[model samples]
Target: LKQVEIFTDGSCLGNPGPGGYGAILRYRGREKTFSAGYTRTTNNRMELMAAIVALEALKEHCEVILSTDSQYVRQGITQWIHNWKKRGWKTADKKPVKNVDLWQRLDAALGQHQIKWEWVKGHAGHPENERCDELARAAAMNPTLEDTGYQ
Candidate 1:
């Protein structure tokens, strides 16, 4: 069966400070939301983690569309996957990939679905994406929070 929409967003207080991710998973006429804060991490990591956690929640193979404002995530799956694989998961200069751990985990968890990623401009009027950003920022502002996913 095909699932509905999945949207994600992430935020960091500073480039490498407290951060968080927000995800909304909708399927089978139902909606579920998940959000979490991280103590010390980059915004990019939280963004990727949102999608990873969302996909991981699926139990069956699905035709899924994952949406995010992060070009990092969209480009990774669409444009960079093959190159990364061919380079033995190395970057263009043959350096180790950043966030290799999360990328690997996301790649594996995605095996259970047919996912098409769609990127939207951040801070745009898209309702879901904006709501995700609000949730992410709220989490980032709260420091006494724990990591909420496969941490």
Candidate 2:
């Protein structure tokens, strides 16, 4: 299988204000970048969207190393999602999971590849991560975009 590396980030003007996600997919010395803005959304949604969009961009299944700065995304997929699924998407506290839409989308995307998830520290000067952050912030500031799933 082809191997790929992805770096992603998300930014929000306010916790529930305009937001955006950025992703960089690298394969065979080639890199492609992606970014999108939402009229209203949360940082966590953007973070998950970064990975979702990156995976969706792959034309075929791959061996993927997905790196992100959000523990919410990292741990949710790595540790929590399984339980959430087995419980029919309910949390241990018996409440509906937050961001269930993105989680479902992410889970579907995940089924198409072999993925290794890694967590990075945001704003600690990692080149690709910083680039993604810059892209995300720039997109967030753009006024013409909207996130359909945000509610």
Candidate 3:
């Protein structure tokens, strides 16, 4: 199977303001970048959205290595998702999941491919991750852009 690399980042102007996500996909000497704006959203949502969108953009199922710097995004998949699914998509206290809608859709998208998760500290020296962060921040600064999915 071919190998693919994906880098993702997300940003929000405020806790509940315009947000955006950026992703870069690479394979077989080809590269693509994606960025989108959201009208109203959270940083965590943007972070997960970036990863989900990047994976969904892949043309075919393949082994993927995804790198990100958001703990919320990483923990959501690596830790919380399993327990949440086991608990009928509820939190530890049985509270309804905050982003159940997005999480459900993202979980389904994830099932379509195989992936490895790698976490990087934000503002570190990772080039791809840093570029994604720049794209996300630029998109967030331009809140007038059309919202892709988050509304």
Best by TM-score: 2
Residue 20 in model 1: shift from native, Å?
A: 0.3
Q: Rank the candidates by TM-score, best first.
A: 2, 3, 1
Off by over 4 Å in 3: 92-95, 144-151
lDDT of 3 by residue, 1-151 (tens): 3889999999898977888888999988799999987777888888888988898888788889999998987788878889889899987788879878778878988898888888998566799998998899888877766444453
Where does candidate 2 have its weakest 10-residue lDDT segment? 142-151
Question: lDDT value for candidate 3?
Answer: 0.85
Q: lDDT tens string, model 1, 1-151?
A: 3665999998888868888888898897788888887787787788898898888888778889888989888888888876777788887788768788888888897787887877888566778988888888888877556544322
Residue pairs with backbone overlap in model 2: none
Off by over 4 Å in 1: 92-94, 143-151
Assess the local accuracy of residue 110 in candidate 3 as a C-alpha lDDT between 0 and 100. Answer: 84
Q: Which candidate tops lDDT?
A: 2
Worst 10 residues of 3 by lDDT: 142-151
lDDT of 2 at 118: 78
